[PDB]
């Protein structure tokens, strides 16, 4: 429903990672699927992500955040990793199911 979609944008703002300049995907815990997914990222997307994270960590150490202007906006958050992650998980399930078979 286009209602809970209001909820989403709410949560997104409540979470607050955008205040560090992080994209939703930059906050994913690096389990195994994510580890693999990242290895498949194009050089540029990978380095962009790297700087964003090193930037947040520097903010976090400083106990500061980004000026309101620079915060990532809900509709401008690039889910760059989700496509790859989605695939890494498909492949794994395939193998898993095939090995029980």
């Amino acid at each position: 429903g286009r209602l809970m979609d209001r909820i989403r944008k709410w949560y997104y703002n409540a979470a607050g990672f955008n205040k560090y300049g992080l994209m939703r995907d930059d906050t994913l815990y690096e389990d195994d699927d994510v580890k693999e997914a990242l290895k498949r990222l194009p050089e540029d997307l990978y380095n962009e992500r790297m700087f964003r994270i090193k930037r947040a960590l520097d903010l976090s150490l400083k106990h500061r955040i980004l000026p309101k202007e620079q915060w990532v906006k809900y509709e401008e958050d690039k889910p760059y990793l989700e496509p790859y992650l989605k695939e890494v998980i498909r492949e794994r399930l395939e193998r898993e199911a095939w090995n029980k078979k």
Partner: protein, 79 residues
Amino acid sequence: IHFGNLARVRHIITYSLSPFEQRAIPNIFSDALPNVWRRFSSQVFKVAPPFLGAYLLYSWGTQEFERLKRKNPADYEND
């Protein structure tokens, strides 16, 4: 040995000054405090709520317990 194998990093420049050129505790009023408040503000409503809800429970039960020690004059009327 963990320094050198850590991560693949490119195109990032950083600048820093010797500690003997800068201020140990700089901008206390223009920067420090403002952020201290910023931070305090953003958490109060997540933290305080349950602690307060406990204070109440505590305060009630402490009193409700003492009240049960006082006598009810309505047990010595009919005698």
